[PDB]
Structure formats: C-alpha cells, structure tokens
Automatic annotation (TrEMBL), chain C:
Species per Swiss-Prot/TrEMBL record: Porcine epidemic diarrhea virus (PEDV)
Function statement: RNA-directed RNA polymerase that catalyzes the transcription of viral genomic and subgenomic RNAs. Acts in complex with nsp7 and nsp8 to transcribe both the minus and positive strands of genomic RNA. The kinase-like NiRAN domain of NSP12 attaches one or more nucleotides to the amino terminus of NSP9, forming a covalent RNA-protein intermediate that serves as transcription/replication primer. Forms a primer, NSP9-pU, which is utilized by the polymerase for the initiation of RNA chains. Interacts with ribosome signal recognition particle RNA (SRP). Together with NSP8, suppress protein integration into the cell membrane, thereby disrupting host immune defenses.
Family (UniProt): Belongs to the coronaviruses polyprotein 1ab family.
Protein name listed in UniProt: ORF1ab polyprotein
Lineage: Viruses, Riboviria, Orthornavirae, Pisuviricota, Pisoniviricetes
Residues of the Peptidase C30 domain: 1-294
Positions spanned in the full protein: 2998 to 3295 of 6781
Intracellular or extracellular location(s): Host cytoplasm, Host perinuclear region; Host endoplasmic reticulum-Golgi intermediate compartment; Host membrane
Length: 7, 292, 294
C-alpha cells in the first residue's frame, strides 16, 4: 500500500 | 567547527506555496508566474478520465487568504499544471532540474498550503528520500538555491510501505519510476554512497576526529570489489576530494580502508555524534561548511 | 512517517539580518525597528569593553542591509551585546518577543555570514549551555529563534566557539548562556550530559514509527533511574506529564523506556534507531508530537 500523501 | 545537515534559507520558496483542494482531497501546490503545479492525485486511477470530468469550480486554490481563480488544467506527467488568473508577484528567478542519486537538496515540508518545516535531504540510490511527512504533505517542494536562482527538483508525492518517501521532478517525472498509484510498491535495495561517506570522514578529520583513521590503504580498484558485496557504491573518480585531501593531508585510499573497518563496527565510539557511517553529506556541503 | 530534525521556515527572520562592521571586524546584526543588536566583540581591538565603547566613533560603524547602508544614531551596552540605534526603521520587522531558553529546549539557528542568511537548522540547548552547531569565522550575530503563532521569539545571538568546537551565544538581553565570557581567553565547556527527557521523546517517536527492537520488558522508577543518570552522563527526569499522550498512543510507559535507556548504554552503537544514534537527545516532546500528529 503506497500512500499518496494528500489530505 | 561542526557539521550539521542544514537547509538553505526558505524565504524565497515560502511565498510560492499554495493550498490546493479538490473534493475530499487537499494538498499543496507550487505557484510560479500564473501557474500552480501540484500532484495529480488531488483529483483522484485513470487520471485521464478524472481530468475529463473535472469541474474547474470544484477547485479551491489559496495563498494564505487570497483565493486564485482557475483558468484551465492540463496533465504534466504525475503533476497537474493549473493555469490561474493571477501572477505570483513574489515568483523568484528559478529553474527546474532533476537530481541524481547521491545529490543533496532542501525539503520545505508544507501542510494546508503553508510551510511548516525545512530540512536537508539526499537522494538515495533507490530514488527515495529519508523524509518526515504525514498526510497532507503531498506537493511539498524540494529545492536548491544557487546565486539567488531557485532550482526546483522535487514535489512530494507518496510514502512507500516501509515509510520512505517518493516525489516527482517538476517535469512530472516520478523519481525511480514509482507509480502515483495506491498499489503495492516496494522500494529497491539501496547502497551507501561511498563518495558521500568519504566527504563525511574528511569533515571528521577537519574537526579533529582521527581515532578511526587507518594507517593502511586500499586501492580504489580493490575497494570497489568489496563495495558491491557490502552495500556501498563504487568510487570511479576522486577529483572531488583534491581540496579536502590537501587540507587534511589524508588521501582517499586511507579513508577507504577506514570505511571497511567502520562499516562493520564503530565499536562503541562516535564520529561527530554518529555511531554508523552516514552518506547524507556531499563534498560540496562539507567544503561549504568547513571553508565557506 | 519518519522523523527529521527540522527548522521552522526562516523567511520572516531573513529580512532582519544586517552586516555590522567596525574597524577590522565584521559580523552579523539583528535589525528590528530602529535598532540593530550585535555581539559587542565587534568593537574589540582581556578586553575592557567599557573602554572600547568609550573610545568608539559612531562614524566608524558600517551597517548594511544588502547594499543599503544604515546611519548610526547611538550605541548602548547591553550585556554581551551592543544595542545600536539607526536612522531607519526595518519595515519588515515581524511581531517579536525575546525569551531565554533552558537546557533541553529546541530552537532554530539562521547561520549568517556578511549580513546574509546562509543556512538554517534546528538545535537543542545542551545541559552545559552549548549548542551542537556548524559555524565558522564570521558567523557571530547569527540569530536563534522560535516561531509561535506568528510571533518570532528570539532566543540566541551567536557569540563564539570554544576550543572543543562547542558553540556559545547570548540571549537577546545580552546574558551569555552558561556564563561563558565573550572573551578570547581559554575557557572549557562544562561537562555535558544527554538530555533524558528528550531521549524519551525520541524513543516514543521510534515506537510510533514501528521501531521496537530496543524496547525493554523491564522497568525502573524515575527516581532510581535519576540516581543512575548522574553517574552515567545523562540528566535527571523531572517532567513526566508531557509523555501522557505518547504513553497512551504507544501503550508504553516511561518506566519501561527508562529501563530501555539503561540497556542501550550497554551495547551502545550496536544498532541505530530510525537511522539515528540510539540515545539521540535533540528532539523534544513537542517536536515529536508535531511530526507524528501535526
């Protein structure tokens, strides 16, 4: 699970 | 005296940060001239389809309290290139440059379109950086400053399962070819950049740390054979150490032998506060901090 | 995820740096309103600073913001600083306060040369009132600061380097940290100890980031640990309430971390924690809580 760091 | 990982002053970049919001998504953008660049996942994936059904008015882009009107959006690799209705009058002289493994740059960590922190990093051989970012950090820029010209080299994109960090360049090209997708990706193995470790040891000598210094030498050729079995990069050229070797009177071959003994063990001692070899400092950083 | 020693953004401070020259000396000053503060050693030829001030000519100062020179109106002694009154107000003066930091507290250094910011990094005041900096000749007058809700809190102006390479400054009231003399005499830094409350914060950051290899199953009471600490190069633990949220989030109490600290002493260097020296003391509970949770 790559985490695309958008809020 | 001293050696510290530091950043170049962030003021000229701070005035370029904006908040970019779309739907349930919020991250940071970089506002230069009349364009805002941000990671495309803010519209999340078939990114082309996402763009095709975009409603421009669903954007909220702001610089502090100042809202920016969206004129148009185009895809730029893993970035959106957003044309806005106002020029950023505080746009600095700037370039874009893609960095290579082993090179240092500055991260301005941003949340909600405002700079929160600044720290230096170094691009690993697997194209990740040792960052500190939590959710909302995407779009934080990486930069270097040369002669007052800001060279933008990174926009933060994602964190891998192991916790290390991946960005794209400002051309929209992801470092290391990682995908801006929520999929299982694992970063490759990484090796210590020997050239950087050498720079660190020269810094140590200049700061009076000599306990670890070998009387022995190892030729660059023989070292490189050991290196590839021991998680370190090869040394091909040593021109970048001429100044430091002259300042200290210690040649690269003696430092390479020292590296071999220190790679396994520091034996409970420290070198400039470290208990393990570090490759985060380039020869350039070391020369600047020692000599200005 | 991750943990890095960061600086707060330096923009608001950068516009306050000036170059201050007098005679053969050049260093940095901090220009706020119509005053420039700088280390008083810029007027030195032991130094009798009162004598040096008595023979000073105002026209011998050269103070500049970029290529703009400021007219000098007056000078007053302020401990180890000079307060120099100038004929122009800095229009970029932020809202600001002064505060003297205490050992174990973090702040930001803006390293300056020739009246211009060159680098920015976070530091932590040591138990012997020195900071682990990187400064070379010309850095005196470089300011230390914290930013709290839009107000810049100035807490340090760089003064000198001791023989060991340790860095010492004064607060903005002109009081030297640690009582070191702003003189070129031989002084040695006091004994320094690792700041245990900060090591505790660091180990909580490590747990939150999935690092548990070093975690002891044993426990030691705070006061018993403190007796050990002062014979083992570490400071006593005085504040524990600050750890309440971290203990709650991790399920690990302070007494367990204290036992872990003792054990980390006994194979010191055998392994890093989050890529750092295992007994890192440069992070405060506040810094950790910010980087973990925002």
């Amino acid at each position: 699970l790559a985490q695309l760091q958008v809020a | 005296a001293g050696l510290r990982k530091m950043a170049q002053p962030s003021g000229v970049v701070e005035k370029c940060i904006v908040r970019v919001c779309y739907g349930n998504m919020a991250l940071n953008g970089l506002w230069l001239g009349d364009t805002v660049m941000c990671p495309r996942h803010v519209i999340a994936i078939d990114y082309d389809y996402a763009l095709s059904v975009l409603r421009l008015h669903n954007f909220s882009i702001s610089s502090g309290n100042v809202f920016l009107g969206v004129v148009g959006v185009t895809m730029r690799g893993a970035l959106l290139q957003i044309k806005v209705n106002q020029n950023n009058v505080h746009t600095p002289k700037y370039t874009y440059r893609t960095v290579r493994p082993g090179e240092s740059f500055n991260i301005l960590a941003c949340y909600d379109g405002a700079a929160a922190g600044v720290y230096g990093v170094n691009m690993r051989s697997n194209y990740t950086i040792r960052g500190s970012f939590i959710n909302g950090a995407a779009g934080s820029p990486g930069y270097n400053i040369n002669n007052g010209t800001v060279e933008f080299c990174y926009l933060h994109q994602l964190e891998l399962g192991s916790g290390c960090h991946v960005g794209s360049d400002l051309d929209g090209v992801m470092y290391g070819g990682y995908e801006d997708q929520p999929t299982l990706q694992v970063e490759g193995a990484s090796s210590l950049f020997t050239e950087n470790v050498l720079a660190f040891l020269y810094a140590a000598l200049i700061n009076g740390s000599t306990w670890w210094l070998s009387s022995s030498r190892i030729a660059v050729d023989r070292f490189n054979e050991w290196a590839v079995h021991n998680g370190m990069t090869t040394v091909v050229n040593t021109d970048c150490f001429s100044i430091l070797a002259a300042k200290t009177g210690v040649d690269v071959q003696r430092l390479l032998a020292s590296i071999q003994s220190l790679h396994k063990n520091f034996g409970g001692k420290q070198i400039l506060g470290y208990t393990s070899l570090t490759d985060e400092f380039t020869t350039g950083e070391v020369i600047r901090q020692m000599y200005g």
